Amino acid sequence: VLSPADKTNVKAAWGKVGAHAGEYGAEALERMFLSFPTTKTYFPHFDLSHGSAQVKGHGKKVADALTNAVAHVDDMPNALSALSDLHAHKLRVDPVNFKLLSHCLLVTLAAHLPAEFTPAVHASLDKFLASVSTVLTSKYR
Template sequence: MASGREKNSGPWSQGSFRLEAEPAETRRAPPVRPAAHRAAPRQPIRAAWPGVAPATEDKRAALCRSRTLLVLIQTQKESTMVLSSDDKANIKAAWSKVGGHGAEYGAEALERMFHSFPTTKTYFPHFDLSHGSAQIKVHGKKVAEALTNASNHLDDLYSALSDLSDLHAHKLRVDPVNFKLLGHCLLVTLARNYPGDFSPAMQASLDKFLSLVTSALASKHL
């Protein structure tokens, strides 16, 4: 008569459902896909904002598209704003004071934008972004010239800025949210340099003007 140990030995011992291991010589290795058909692993990228977990390229692209769409929807609404005669007078008065300081203030606004919104630096990879940089001064002059042109065509901003909109949408491929960020920094720059003239009415008029400029520059992104 077999002992208790012998009776309970085997593949289903102790009442547990345990299959015996397959002999090594009969095992088949899983098929190995050719290297050409293997999908490359997605590499996580650094988050665009502090405190946000890293995302994949697809997630970041989707986030950028969503953010751009929201900005475009908002700028479409802003494009329906109308400058009153008082607004136009305030804008003309502000720009007459700027005069020959346009390049200086444009450069200051760019520096403020780079410090306050560091992600905007990605559009200037070959620039010297240090304080007083000659490259920032040159670009600040371009910003000032564009705004001077806009202030001289308040009744036809879209036509006046059409070429710039084409350039930023199709060649430079700038996210239109950056126009709003620069507009905000320009407003702060003007307020700092002309505190006595920056009344609530002046601020409202300039804010409306810069919002319309943003809408005009973003129009070719639609």
């Protein structure tokens, strides 16, 4: 469960990322596809090449979901409910894959936030992404 300090750290990283969040979401997906090729199976209909408008658009969607979670950090289960249904019920996304994308999201923040990405903030971000992932795999039926 996220602590007050974690919530503060996550909000601060969010603020520093600012309007780049969408671009960063796309970068994290690209890193995930190149680094963990098995994840590409979920996007057969996507052109996953660098510069793909589809990956760019999807990155913005991922980013928006994450900012919705930080904006309602005290009740992510509720805020992320519809997305949880989609990833588990319709997409059948393997739970292991959330760890892969969460790692790529951390790597992306690290490559873009020299001052922000301290060990403490790194730990807070990891907890937050783990929290988000827990909610998105909570709907397995």
